[PDB]
Symmetry: D2
Subunit: 313 residues, 4 copies
């Protein structure tokens, strides 16, 4: 049987996941949503494109969780946009999604995209009852992609020769490690030394990565980023389906690493056929650990606020 990918949410990211899953031949695709017509429509549009590029994949749109039965991978974008209270609405969505995955796809590898990410993934894991190593959040890969793109422009090198090291969440909760970020193995601080850029331009690049999501919103005005997010989650899915062992920053349940337990945090992980196969642990200096703890504190509060709304957690 082909692999089966279920996309819970058929909006801008959802459609893009479907398209990419088709193009990359990851397998059959189920697009789920509460909106009638939307998933069916996008699913049939993508199916109808299949003969052009030559991929053979079933695309199904559905409004019933039974359609996700036996999904090897589930990618969750279901939620509402920030048009505080976002927490309350999206948490109720995670509850519906969790129960749906619990019933129909308990063996799935689950990638959460819904915001606020680190809390929503934490809640989805508990509501679904899936083992934590099989439930992760997409955030870090997106920050890393933006950062790499900015640097590839700064140095006029290939994106393929830029590596960045990122932990935490987005924005002020991101913890970049310049010293573990390189061009062809040469770390960013030495590139500054060599005159390839300046520390001020690197600081602006770092700040632009923090604000990267907001920059896209400012440009589109009517929505947020969807290509790079979608590409990011597909890469995680792909490392699972192909047992690739990529090292990828994702929101994963920590159990002692970095001094944190029972909470999702953005960390470098090795992704393979068993989900999060390994959490990578590096030393952080005082300032790094300062930012790190600050994000954990912020996410702790969101999770507590979620416990407020849903004591079942």
């Amino acid at each position: 049987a082909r692999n089966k990918i279920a996309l819970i949410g058929s909006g801008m990211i959802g459609g893009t996941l479907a398209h990419l899953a088709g193009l990359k031949e990851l397998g059959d695709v189920v697009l789920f949503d509460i909106a009638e017509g939307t998933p069916q429509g996008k699913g049939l549009d993508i199916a109808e494109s299949s003969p052009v590029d030559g991929f053979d994949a079933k695309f199904t749109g559905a409004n019933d969780y039974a359609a996700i039965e036996g999904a090897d991978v589930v990618i969750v974008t279901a939620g509402v946009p920030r048009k505080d209270d976002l927490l309350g609405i999206n948490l109720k969505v995670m509850e519906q999604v969790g129960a749906g995955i619990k019933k129909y796809a308990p063996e799935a590898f689950v990638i959460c995209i819904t915001n606020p990410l680190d809390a929503m993934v934490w809640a989805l894991q508990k509501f679904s009852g899936l083992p934590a190593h099989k439930v992760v959040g997409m955030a870090g890969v997106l920050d890393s992609a933006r950062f790499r793109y900015f640097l590839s422009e700064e140095f006029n090198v290939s994106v393929e020769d830029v590596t960045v090291f990122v932990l935490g969440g987005h924005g002020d909760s991101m913890v970049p490690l310049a010293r573990y970020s390189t061009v062809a193995g040469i770390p960013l601080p030495d590139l500054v030394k060599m005159g390839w850029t300046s520390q001020d331009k690197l600081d602006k690049i770092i700040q632009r990565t923090r604000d990267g999501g907001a920059e896209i919103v400012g440009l589109l005005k009517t929505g947020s980023a969807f290509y790079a997010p979608a590409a990011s989650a597909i890469q995680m899915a792909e490392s699972y389906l192909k047992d690739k062992k990529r090292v990828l920053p994702v929101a994963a349940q920590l159990s002692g690493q970095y001094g944190v337990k029972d909470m999702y945090v953005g960390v470098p992980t090795v992704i393979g056929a068993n989900g999060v196969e390994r959490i990578i642990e590096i030393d952080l200096d005082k300032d790094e650990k300062a930012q790190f703890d600050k994000s954990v504190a912020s996410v702790a509060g969101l999770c507590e606020a979620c416990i407020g709304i849903a004591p079942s957690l």
Copy 2:
């Protein structure tokens, strides 16, 4: 230097064209639109995705035609949705687009998507002044893709083993030839004989292909198809850029084939580094010819109504 692809219109199809061009490494991409922010945002979004798959391409969003200068391929989706009324607004858009291509990308291979396709490509070729062999419309490839998909489902074979032969435009203007459509070389009427499906099911499949665009609109409610249309236009672009000589049904200027001159009609064509390098003419039986003539006549009616609005087209 890399190939340069200019996308005139940065909407649902436009953004998809850009994503596909990035993924397939067809070259650098300019997203153009009149809306500020939109092409800049989609362009940067896609650029930002590029380290994931490792493609190297520049993405630029622009609100100025000068950004398209020297484009090897121009793909046009600029226009407004249908919420003869449409004709007038989109015609004026083809005039602006035409003038920008003439000025900044005169050597471009141009692929028109804007509806109503059959008149807009013909108008766009005139306004722009480009040689007709370098200006085509995307329609046939989409209808063909839908048709093939439905057949692959009916027979449970790979999409790559289904071929269909489509003349004309969308809907009632489509003239599909079942006898030149095949699974692995076996024509559809033979597959009907062998019991692989029935004539009534084949008939419904052709009808579904006619109504294909409207089926997606009914599902989406808020807009129309964009993934299959984009994929279709990108396939045409790619045959040009790679000098592939794919046989693709496109809206092309006829000059004698099928008795038709000075008009764009959907016909299978060989697309290579010189654009429309060959239009394929087959013999039609009397019924098929009558279907083809009705479709061409309806396209001529649309073009004449464009002339009434923009006399410079005459």
Copy 3:
């Protein structure tokens, strides 16, 4: 767990099978051979190449059949070159390979390449005991590739728009059907009618296809084709592994189709996750049927000679 591909034989075709399996990310690859070092060397060379393109697959060389345990697909090129005595040595190889698959990969999709193909795949099925729908021979896809390529050059169209219909085996045992061969849905005889080529040039292209293997041998002098044969077998394997339902001409066990039972014959088949899922049966006119029966008769003679050598095949 990744798919596992076992290559029984690590010569020219085998090494190409491994390379393509890596490049296309079909899974982990075991190269098996009788020669020590050859499969280990090639496997490590291809593994060392993997960081360039970024594919992650394990490559193992082995001289022990236990290495092939649990293989999803097994591709067999083991044999010796013609340097009816060939039949004898290669039948012994099929017996060893058969026993090794039976013991270690009884659930594999098995693709036979070893010559002479039509007898060897039939012998290999019997020796191995695998269900016949999981054991096929590569042949038709190669004749088909050659033919398509030659036509694509003749007409100067993309290889992607050429389809050919080929029954039987290589050389004089090939039964090509020009009428079920097309460019963009247009059968070759209509293309002759339209002036795209002549009957005499089509006849020559057909004969070139019969002689295709020998033409490569004539050029290389030291051995035979390996790129197109490897590509052809890999396509078959992918259709299985992706459940793609491609229609491919392969040597398959017939059970009534075309009046044939209990023999392997080159026929267009749908290949999916269950192996040979459908064997396509068309009607043949009187001349085509005579050509087909003559081809089947010479395959029956070859199998009878194999029974002569190895009575356990009776």
Copy 4:
């Protein structure tokens, strides 16, 4: 016009270069060789494979240099195998090849593979007269692919997540910098401190990389590596053809960097549409600089012995 890739030498690597150029749709390919039949045979074999995957490319075999005319990229494997009189035979070959490039493809980007690489590329640049930034040697990418592969195994991570930094040539001429080699951005010496590996294992992986070519020869017995070498050279061609700006270790002409002038040394370089666009110069500690100087001196001595065989190089 499609890109044109000329392959000077149609042996094991040559054939593999051709196949990969086909699969990756890099352009039309000319296989050239002194041996009649070989390049025509390999060329036709690969062309015949092309309808399977659907790439459209011309493959030509030739024994006349005029076939390479206007090549965008020329990759040279022409020479004889190692069975200082090798230096003399292969130098004579570089003379012929250089003269054919000068006459027929003076604007080519040229990639040398012929051994001994460090002298042959230098000598090939001088014979052909091409600008030095357009003539490079393939070496470092190969050592780097092997290195990364061995590391990916030790750490159980994707090959895509390992980066290594290699100066100099193969074997004892290699100068690897563990401190600019990484897993996920984390340098190797730090990984040793973290317990993910030991200095012993790391030293053995370095030594294994130095002996990597000889390890493959010890396994194959009758030949040397060809898959990883071909993949490495193709990555270099591709970065040029796509203006990718990949950072790749290649043998390039230094003009002041690391204190070296008028000599080809393995250094990481930016490769784009103008060939060697930037040679990366880092600071070296005293030990690293001694290793580098010893490697460069041994390259200088080889080139001096070439000047004694062919005084025209002085």
